[PDB]
Amino acid sequence: RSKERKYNESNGVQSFEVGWVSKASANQRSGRAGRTGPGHCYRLYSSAVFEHDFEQFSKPEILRMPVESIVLQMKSMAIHNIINFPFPTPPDRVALSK
Amino acid sequence: PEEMRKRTTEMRLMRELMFREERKARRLKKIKSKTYRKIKKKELMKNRELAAVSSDEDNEDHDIARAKERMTLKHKTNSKWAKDMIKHGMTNDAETREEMEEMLRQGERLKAKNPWDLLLTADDSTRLKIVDFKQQDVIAEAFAGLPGWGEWA
Amino acid sequence: SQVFGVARIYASFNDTFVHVTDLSGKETIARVTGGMKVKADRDESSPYAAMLAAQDVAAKCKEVGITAVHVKIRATGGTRTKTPGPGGQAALRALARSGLRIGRIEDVTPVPSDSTRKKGGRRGRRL
Amino acid sequence: VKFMTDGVLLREMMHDFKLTKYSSIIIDEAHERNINTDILIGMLSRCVRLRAKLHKENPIEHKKLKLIIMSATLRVSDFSENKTLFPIAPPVLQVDA
Amino acid sequence: IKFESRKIMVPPHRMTPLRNSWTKIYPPLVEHLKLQVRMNLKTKSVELRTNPKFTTDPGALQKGADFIKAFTLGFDLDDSIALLRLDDLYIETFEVKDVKTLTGDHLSRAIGRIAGKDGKTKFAIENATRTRIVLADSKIHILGGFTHIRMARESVVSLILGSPPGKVYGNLRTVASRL
RNA sequence: UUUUU
Numbered sequence: 001r002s003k004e005r006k007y008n009e010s011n012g013v014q015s016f017e018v019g020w021v022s023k024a025s026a027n028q029r030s031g032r033a034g035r036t037g038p039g040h041c042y043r044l045y046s047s048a049v050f051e052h053d054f055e056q057f058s059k060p061e062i063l064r065m066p067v068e069s070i071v072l073q074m075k076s077m078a079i080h081n082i083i084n085f086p087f088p089t090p091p092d093r094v095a096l097s098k
Numbered sequence: 099p100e101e102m103r104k105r106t107t108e109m110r111l112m113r114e115l116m117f118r119e120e121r122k123a124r125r126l127k128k129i130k131s132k133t134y135r136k137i138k139k140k141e142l143m144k145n146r147e148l149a150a151v152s153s154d155e156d157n158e159d160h161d162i163a164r165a166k167e168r169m170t171l172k173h174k175t176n177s178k179w180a181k182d183m184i185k186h187g188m189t190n191d192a193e194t195r196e197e198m199e200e201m202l203r204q205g206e207r208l209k210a211k212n213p214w215d216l217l218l219t220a221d222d223s224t225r226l227k228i229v230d231f232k233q234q235d236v237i238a239e240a241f242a243g244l245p246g247w248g249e250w251a
Numbered sequence: 252s253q254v255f256g257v258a259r260i261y262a263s264f265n266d267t268f269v270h271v272t273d274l275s276g277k278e279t280i281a282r283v284t285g286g287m288k289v290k291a292d293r294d295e296s297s298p299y300a301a302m303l304a305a306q307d308v309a310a311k312c313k314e315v316g317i318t319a320v321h322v323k324i325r326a327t328g329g330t331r332t333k334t335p336g337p338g339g340q341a342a343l344r345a346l347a348r349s350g351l352r353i354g355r356i357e358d359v360t361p362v363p364s365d366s367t368r369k370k371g372g373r374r375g376r377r378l
Numbered sequence: 379v380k381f382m383t384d385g386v387l388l389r390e391m392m393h394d395f396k397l398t399k400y401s402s403i404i405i406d407e408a409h410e411r412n413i414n415t416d417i418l419i420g421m422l423s424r425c426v427r428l429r430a431k432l433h434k435e436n437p438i439e440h441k442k443l444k445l446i447i448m449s450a451t452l453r454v455s456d457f458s459e460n461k462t463l464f465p466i467a468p469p470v471l472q473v474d475a
Numbered sequence: 476i477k478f479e480s481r482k483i484m485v486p487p488h489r490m491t492p493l494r495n496s497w498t499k500i501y502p503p504l505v506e507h508l509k510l511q512v513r514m515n516l517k518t519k520s521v522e523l524r525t526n527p528k529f530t531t532d533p534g535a536l537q538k539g540a541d542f543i544k545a546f547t548l549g550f551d552l553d554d555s556i557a558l559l560r561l562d563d564l565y566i567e568t569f570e571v572k573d574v575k576t577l578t579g580d581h582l583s584r585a586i587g588r589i590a591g592k593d594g595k596t597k598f599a600i601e602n603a604t605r606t607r608i609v610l611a612d613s614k615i616h617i618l619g620g621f622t623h624i625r626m627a628r629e630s631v632v633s634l635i636l637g638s639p640p641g642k643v644y645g646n647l648r649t650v651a652s653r654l
Numbered sequence: 655u656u657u658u659u
Contacts, residue, residue: 004656062416077238344541387659390659
């Protein structure tokens, strides 16, 4: 379980929700053991829940928080057409619009 | 000179203007419906209240106003109009009762007794005069991805 | 090389006429109305009806030899409305698009100096 | 050899885009998918191509820049398969241990 | 695309607004429609012509003339531009006396009823019916789609015949929901 | 919860 900050763009309301971590995040937690010796990871959820409910990777940072600072910086680069910028994962149009 | 022509035009606009208020003022003058005049009065009192056009009354001003009201007692039911409506059952109706109560409330108003606006000009003059591009745009570039008034136009 | 006719457009409330005649006005070249191009009597005054009527006369006139028309648009006039309706406006636009050269456009609505009484009555009409 | 926050490179890019001071740039912990890291990889993909072109034009005046993306559990398609980032898919090296 | 011309006489009370809006009038006419625009100050009539070598759309000239005409009747520029943008907009025009022979204060009150206080009633009709209305003295012009202008006309006519604005307003909500 | 020039 992880407490993530979810930003509702429609109403600008910020919420903190406790939800399932991603599979990679869980794999990273299991990796904390095994750095100094053979170790064990005891997960408090069943494998059935893990395979079905856990997302493979958590959503990228860009798709979860405001981008007004980034747009200003890129506009100071004379990057007028942010839409055609080669992003790894482009930000949502609505977030860009606001 | 031709400046004289400019003077006539300026007068002509001012005359055309004065007529427009006269026509509008003439028409609003004829309408004397209670509902229409009531709506206009209410909206005016809001605007004056919201903009605070009216100056605050000093304590001495209130005392003088209260003195006249006590001297006269002009806002009680002994007046000719109030006595006429009351004694003849015309105040049982809602509308004329409101006017009587409006008069009475207005009279009541006058009877009442470590250590731990200037509008901001955000114009370009009030500015932090800090000092720090075309080639950087060339770096961007490398990335890639009244006419017709009087003559034919 | 350029022959002129006259295209008379009568834009009433419940129908639109497009009548093309020679310069004098005695000889009719083609008369088509909104009713002849629509199935329901409600849509006879519709702009769509006028467009079909205008296109039909435009095609017919080209066959005859007429290559340009002077537009004389009119309303019912008289004691009724004096400005042509959208049916007339639509007919004018279709005629322009047809390629038929538009010479001169004038409004010839019958306007009375002063007329008889209007059919409405004292209380009015057209609820 | 200089260790620094992503924002430091972002600002140094604000002031000099070609990063003439640097011979190679390492973006570590890219699996974190930080917004700043995403912006830097997007900008650096463009920078490195620029510097390679300039080196091809004038090796003496202009030199190449080598780019390394370092991560643990990367979704390699995010950076290898994204042709908008890199028109030619970069090689991927896996440390098997 | 033969050489053709249109002339649209500007009434004097619309000349000054035509001046202030000329900068935004000739660009769309000369660029999109490829029309040759000009105003004859001697005749005070806007002149439009088809350029045979450049103009390509046969309906550009008539489309432009209607756009000038709409501004001439009293419609704002942007609303007139809708005639250039679209092809299914028409102008309905009728007089108060056509509906009912009103004179004196009766005519003044009829115009006031249509406009409403602060123009609210006119805007109410315009929004509900998706049309634009210009109330020039006793002369009423309505701009919009053919089915739309008829709906606005009926709401206007009911006001002329004496129907109070309040009842007409409720009827606008009903038709607006149907739309 | 994180976290940044």
